[PDB]
Amino acid sequence: GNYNYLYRLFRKSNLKPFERDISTEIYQAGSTPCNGVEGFNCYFPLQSYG
Amino acid sequence: IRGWIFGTTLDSKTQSLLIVNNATNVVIKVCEFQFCNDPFLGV
Ligand SMILES: *[C@@H]1O[C@H](CO)[C@@H](O[C@@H]2O[C@H](CO)[C@@H](O)[C@H](O)[C@H]2NC(C)=O)[C@H](O)[C@H]1NC(C)=O
Ligand SMILES: *[C@@H]1O[C@H](CO)[C@@H](O)[C@H](O)[C@H]1NC(C)=O
C-alpha cells in the first residue's frame, strides 16, 4: 500500500468548481467540538488510497 | 492604503490571498502566511 496519495474524506459542504482545499482540520461529526484530538465524531479528514 | 488580505481565518491555517503594492511593485501571493494580531506595515 502506498501512503503518498491522499484524498479528502469529509467536508461539511460541497466544493465550488475548481476549488482546492488542503486544510487538515479535524472534522467535527458531532456536536462536541474537537480540539485537534481524534476520537468519537472527530476523525482525520484525509485518507490514504493504499 | 497599500494592500489587501483575503481569506477565512487569516491565521496561517488556511490559504489567504495577499496583495501588496509597494511604490512601483505589485506583489500577489497565496502563501499560508502567519499574520499578526493586527497586521500593518511600518514606514
Ligand atoms: C467557505 O467558507 C465558509 C465559511 O466557513 C463556508 O460557509 C459555511 O458553511 C457551513 C457549512 O459547510 C455553514 O454551516 C456555515 O454557516 C457557513 N458560514 C458562512 C459564513 O457562510 C463555505 O461553505 C465555504 N465554502 C465551501 C465551498 O464549502
Ligand atoms: C516590494 O517588495 C518586493 C518583495 O520583496 C521587493 O522585491 C521589491 O523590491 C519591493 N519594491 C519596493 C519599491 O519597495
UniProtKB/Swiss-Prot annotation, chain A:
Q: What is the effect of changing Q47R?
A: In strain: Omicron/BA.1, Omicron/BA.2, Omicron/BA.2.12.1
Outcome after substituting E38A: In strain: Omicron/BA.1, Omicron/BA.2, Omicron/BA.2.12.1, Omicron/BA.2.75, Omicron/BA.4, Omicron/BA.5, Omicron/BQ.1.1, Omicron/XBB.1.5, Omicron/EG.5.1
Q: What is the recorded phenotype of mutating A29V?
A: Increased resistance to neutralizing antibodies
What, per the annotation, is the impact of changing Y7F? In strain: B.1.1.298
The annotated consequence of V37A reads: Increased resistance to neutralizing antibodies
| Disulphide-bridged cysteine pairs | C34-C42
Region described as Disordered: 9-44
What result follows from mutating N14K? In strain: Omicron/BA.2.75, Omicron/BQ.1.1, Omicron/XBB.1.5, Omicron/EG.5.1
**Taxonomic superkingdom:** Viruses
Impact reported for F40V: In strain: Omicron/BA.4, Omicron/BA.5, Omicron/BQ.1.1
Consequence recorded when altering Y7F? Decreased HLA binding to NF9 epitope. Increased binding affinity to human ACE2
Query: Which residues lie within the region annotated Immunodominant HLA epitope recognized by the CD8+?
Result: 2-10
Return the annotated region ranges for Receptor-binding motif. 1-50
Swapping L6Q leads to an effect described as: In strain: Omicron/BA.2.12.1
Q: What role does this protein play?
A: Attaches the virion to the cell membrane by interacting with host receptor, initiating the infection. The major receptor is host ACE2. When S2/S2' has been cleaved, binding to the receptor triggers direct fusion at the cell membrane. When S2/S2' has not been cleaved, binding to the receptor results in internalization of the virus by endocytosis using host TFRC and GRM2 and leading to fusion of the virion membrane with the host endosomal membrane. Alternatively, may use NRP1/NRP2 and integrin as entry receptors.
Subunit and interaction comment? Binds to host ACE2. RBD also interacts with the N-linked glycan on 'Asn-90' of ACE2. Cleavage of S generates a polybasic C-terminal sequence on S1 that binds to host Neuropilin-1 (NRP1) and Neuropilin-2 (NRP2) receptors. Interacts with host integrin alpha-5/beta-1 (ITGA5:ITGB1) and with ACE2 in complex with integrin alpha-5/beta-1 (ITGA5:ITGB1). May interact via cytoplasmic c-terminus with M protein. May interact (via N-terminus) with host bilirubin and biliverdin, thereby preventing antibody binding to the SARS-CoV-2 spike NTD via an allosteric mechanism.
> What protein is this chain from?
Spike protein S1
Q: What is the source species? A: Severe acute respiratory syndrome coronavirus 2 (2019-nCoV)
- Gene (UniProt): S
Which residues of the entire protein appear here: the answer is 447 to 496 of 1273
Swiss-Prot record, chain B:
Q: Which consequence is recorded for altering N21Q?
A: Partial loss of biliverdin affinity
What stretch of the whole protein does this chain cover?
A: 101 to 143 of 1273
Q: Which gene codes for it? A: S
Complexes and interactors: Binds to host ACE2. RBD also interacts with the N-linked glycan on 'Asn-90' of ACE2. Cleavage of S generates a polybasic C-terminal sequence on S1 that binds to host Neuropilin-1 (NRP1) and Neuropilin-2 (NRP2) receptors. Interacts with host integrin alpha-5/beta-1 (ITGA5:ITGB1) and with ACE2 in complex with integrin alpha-5/beta-1 (ITGA5:ITGB1). May interact via cytoplasmic c-terminus with M protein. May interact (via N-terminus) with host bilirubin and biliverdin, thereby preventing antibody binding to the SARS-CoV-2 spike NTD via an allosteric mechanism.
| Entry-listed glycosylation sites | N22
Q: What does this protein do?
A: Attaches the virion to the cell membrane by interacting with host receptor, initiating the infection. The major receptor is host ACE2. When S2/S2' has been cleaved, binding to the receptor triggers direct fusion at the cell membrane. When S2/S2' has not been cleaved, binding to the receptor results in internalization of the virus by endocytosis using host TFRC and GRM2 and leading to fusion of the virion membrane with the host endosomal membrane. Alternatively, may use NRP1/NRP2 and integrin as entry receptors.
> What name appears for this protein in its UniProt entry?
Spike protein S1
